[PDB]
Curated annotation (Swiss-Prot):
Disulfide bonds join C1-C8, C10-C21. Sulfated glycoprotein widely distributed in basement membranes and tightly associated with laminin. Also binds to collagen IV and perlecan. It probably has a role in cell-extracellular matrix interactions. The record marks H55, Y57, R234 as: Involved in perlecan binding. Residues 26-245 form the Nidogen G2 beta-barrel domain. The gene is Nid1. It comes from the Eukaryota. Interacts with FBLN1. Interacts with LGALS3BP. Interacts with PLXDC1. Interacts with SVEP1. This is Nidogen-1. It is found in: Secreted, Extracellular space, Extracellular matrix, Basement membrane. Transmembrane segments: none annotated. N- and O-glycosylated. Glycans are attached at N13.
Length: 245
């Protein structure tokens, strides 16, 4: 049990599950490592990177999370721009809660595994993602390990990418949460080009009035950026969890 919970359950002024608790309103950080094995376009030569750093800063106000993945080769940077969900999982974790609806942290305590798959329609292959979250560490920071492997279409160097607001349904059943969504994104050359991809997701965790079978996540103010100079991939978005309306 957490040093801020009773025997578990976080006491007033605090939130989370039993094993992990955080003060209400206070910002949080989610850090870890990223290993990649990505094939761009039709290429047969995969860009491999490892020991890369992921630092995440979340502000509680609007459930806004900022994710920065540093030391990303110019060879994959632009191509990874559409993959905001890599960092979006954290937005789900700390989404603004409505009436009778809890966010990911209240449900998992930051302890869980996530497996996601993405398919870009009209393009071969798919990209598989695997992440592990292990609660708060010795320095008081949440933890996250990320493993990416697969194929992604090619995006022109210097190209830009835009994502409009959207909603996602997270289904709950027996300590397992699943989600499936088809969305679109726009690519703008250094002239626009709209594209669509499909995301599938499975979240596994352990549990000690059951939870709603279905919750809706509302995402807006999304920004994805890649800087060739600093070689830093960034994803930022705001979040709200509640019922379909």
């Amino acid at each position: 049990c957490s040093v801020h919970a009773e025997c578990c359950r976080c006491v007033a002024n605090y939130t989370g599950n039993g094993r992990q608790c955080v003060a209400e309103g206070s910002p949080q950080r989610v850090n870890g490592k990223v290993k990649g094995r990505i094939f761009v376009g039709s290429s047969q030569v995969p860009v491999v990177f490892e020991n890369t750093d992921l630092h995440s800063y979340v502000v509680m106000n609007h459930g806004r999370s900022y994710t920065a993945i540093s030391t990303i080769p110019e060879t994959v940077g632009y191509s990874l721009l559409p993959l905001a969900p890599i960092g979006g999982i954290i937005g789900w974790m700390f989404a603004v809660e409505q009436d009778g609806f809890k966010n990911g942290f209240s449900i998992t305590g930051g302890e869980f595994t996530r497996q996601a798959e993405v398919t870009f329609l009209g393009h071969p292959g798919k990209l598989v993602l695997k992440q592990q979250f292990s609660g708060i560490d010795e320095h008081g920071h949440l933890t996250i390990s990320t493993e990416l492997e697969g194929r992604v279409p090619q995006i022109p160097y210097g190209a830009s990418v835009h994502i409009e607001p959207y909603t996602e349904l997270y289904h709950y059943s027996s300590s397992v949460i699943t989600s499936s969504s088809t969305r679109e994104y726009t690519v703008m050359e250094p002239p626009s080009h709209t594209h669509i991809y499909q995301w599938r997701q499975t979240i596994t965790f352990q549990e000690c009035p059951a939870l709603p079978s279905t919750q809706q996540l509302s995402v807006d103010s999304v920004f994805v950026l890649y800087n060739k100079e600093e070689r830093i991939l960034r994803y930022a978005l705001s979040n709200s969890i509640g019922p379909v309306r």
